[PDB]
Design a protein around this ligand. Structure first.
Ligand SMILES: NC(=O)c1ccc[n+]([C@@H]2O[C@H](COP(=O)([O-])OP(=O)(O)OC[C@H]3O[C@@H](n4cnc5c(N)ncnc54)[C@H](O)[C@@H]3O)[C@@H](O)[C@H]2O)c1
Ligand SMILES: NC(=O)c1ccc[n+]([C@@H]2O[C@H](COP(=O)([O-])OP(=O)(O)OC[C@H]3O[C@@H](n4cnc5c(N)ncnc54)[C@H](O)[C@@H]3O)[C@@H](O)[C@H]2O)c1
Lengths: 240, 236
């Protein structure tokens, strides 16, 4: 009846989000390497193509929501996968799912970026043009040839490009009647109480996603919601 | 039982916020020039000081929340008031209420800034140094001698300084165990294709004042139907 598609649903935020949205009465179609209705590794072009097809086959009448939580962190063995999953794993899926989203009830989507998205300027992001141009092989080569902290480049670079990608889609998605926002998590407890000085439980990310997926955020669109206990504000008080 | 102080409660977002927070079971202590438990004019230092004392008198045991919605837009007769209310009307109150908030239950505060806060860079803000130093007379003088479109300067400049002020208070409020965030209402046709209802600003404030936002602090939530994204895709 009310379908919400969730990538990266097996663990962390994706899993916590699935739990919350399921309690809200939604039917979840998850995408992940395991424990998901759609088994897929989004690190390759073919893998996402198949994941997209498998999802749509289950959402012929459309979908009410989309939450893209799949992601890989810095210090991932093969840095090329960080770029593939973090960027294309999100961009290709949201772009292919928009038609189905347009047919849903109060359709909304949330993309999980990262506070890291702001540690680099898009115009000075070594991956920007390649990613924006869909040149996956090139983007993966950039980080695998970066050397020193190529991990941070791959992570912050993909996330920064991802947040911009989402923001540049605001006009089109708005026209389609589908809200699209990102959350930018800070330190999460992935293997109430004031936020400053502690990590967040994955559920604290999920509670914000639920809000962004609900009528309470009916006028929130194209925004990046930072969920980091205040760290970003201390670091960049004049930058927002 | 659960007290939430709301400035600018008489109309707009402040009125809608009072409504939603009351529907949640909160007791509201409003601050405004009319239709409020605390009648006050935040455009002057003495007005704020009196407003602060009147509120604290009703919150001797503390308060659970604070929502600062008082504000004046560009094209206000006397521009000095735009700066006084938008900036000092917010900063002096949040600073004076922190001790009370600290005594609260899951205390949180929301300041209403504006997407206009992003139209200027803090280091290029003619009011920045003046407002940060608490030089109200000088700040009012700047906008009153700005001539053409002093209204946009007063507004954007006060809002920009406000967001920065709130962010510069993240460390202290974080240490005090009180969350402090801002929402930046939109202020042509947005991507979502329509104007916002005050209730759509209030529902976000309600969220920020709730446990659902337990890990959201020092953030500025833009509520503008997508305009900011279209205008500043690479800036956030
Ligand atoms: N915890 C943090 O420090 C932090 C901070 C900022 C942003 N984030 C972001 O939040 C999101 C979720 O992070 P998390 O901390 O909950 O991690 P997690 O490991 O709990 O979840 C990540 C998910 O991505 C899936 N995944 C990984 N590679 C995949 C692939 N190649 N194909 C398909 N699915 C794949 C995993 O199976 C997993 O379910 C990510 O986008 C991440 O970058 C995390
Ligand atoms: N929705 C929008 O158009 C929009 C856009 C961007 C920012 N904002 C900001 O949101 C806040 C409230 O906006 P609104 O649209 O609900 O406005 P509104 O006019 O409906 O409410 C503003 C409130 O401020 C009060 N106020 C004005 N001067 C005061 C003073 N000198 N002393 C005490 N109280 C005073 C008013 O009486 C009123 O209750 C303001 O800070 C405003 O700048 C609104």
């Amino acid at each position: 009846m009310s379908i919400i598609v969730i990538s990266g649903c097996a663990t962390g935020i994706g899993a916590a989000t699935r739990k919350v949205l399921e309690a809200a009465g939604h039917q979840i179609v998850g995408i992940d390497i395991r424990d998901a209705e759609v088994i897929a590794d989004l690190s390759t072009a073919e893998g996402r193509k198949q994941a997209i097809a498998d999802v749509l086959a289950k959402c012929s009448k459309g979908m009410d929501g989309l939450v893209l939580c799949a992601g890989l962190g810095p210090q991932t063995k093969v840095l090329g996968n960080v770029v593939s999953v973090n960027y294309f794993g999100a961009t290709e899926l949201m772009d292919a799912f928009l038609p189905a989203l347009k047919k849903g009830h109060q359709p909304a989507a949330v993309v999980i970026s990262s506070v890291a998205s702001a540690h680099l300027a898009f115009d000075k992001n070594p991956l920007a043009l390649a990613l924006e141009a869909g040149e996956e092989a090139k983007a993966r080569a950039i980080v695998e040839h970066a050397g020193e902290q190529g991990g941070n480049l791959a992570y912050a670079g993909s996330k920064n490009a991802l947040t911009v990608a989402v923001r540049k889609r605001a006009a089109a998605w708005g026209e389609a009647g589908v809200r699209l926002n990102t959350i930018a998590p800070g330190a999460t407890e992935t293997p109430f109480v004031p936020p400053m000085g502690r990590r967040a439980e994955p559920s604290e990310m999920a509670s914000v996603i639920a809000f962004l997926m609900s009528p309470a955020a009916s006028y929130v669109h194209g925004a990046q919601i930072v969920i980091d206990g205040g760290i970003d504000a201390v670091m960049r008080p004049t930058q927002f």
